[PDB]
Structure 1
Amino acid sequence: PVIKVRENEPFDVALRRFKRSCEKAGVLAEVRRREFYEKPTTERKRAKASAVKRH
């Protein structure tokens, strides 16, 4: 999420772009998913449940 503030760019919209960039990059989601170890069977079950719910 490296962003340089544009020429004469206001600060608030600059970090709004920062938040949008980090949300697009999924930093917080990756960190949340890597806080604890999910057993491979648990990961497969969660993926299957998400697929079923989405379908």
Structure 2
Amino acid sequence: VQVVVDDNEPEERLLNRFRREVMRAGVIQECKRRRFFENTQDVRKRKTREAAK
């Protein structure tokens, strides 16, 4: 689940924006809080239903 700095060159550029798309605070804000058990399968799938079509 790490990040690539496989590119050479003595460059000082961050390149931390490449992993801030898939991983980000997104996989940690979906987690680290409290799970609703039933509202996670209801409310989180209800807003994605109307935003699809």
TM-score by length of 1: 0.59
* Cα RMSD for the two superposed structures: 2.1
TM-score by length of 2: 0.60
Take 2:34 and 2:7, find their aligned partners in 1: how far apart are those partners? 40
Identity percentage over the alignment?
8
Residue type at the aligned position of 2:35: E
Runs of 5+ unmatched residues, structure 1: none
C-alpha distance after superposition, 1:10-48 (max 9, x if no partner): 221xx22x3212422x24101011121221221122112
Runs of 5+ unmatched residues, structure 2: none
- Give the match for residue 41 of structure 1: 38
Provide the aligned length of Structure 1 versus Structure 2. 51
Residue type at the aligned position of 1:33: E
- Name the one with the larger helix percent: 1
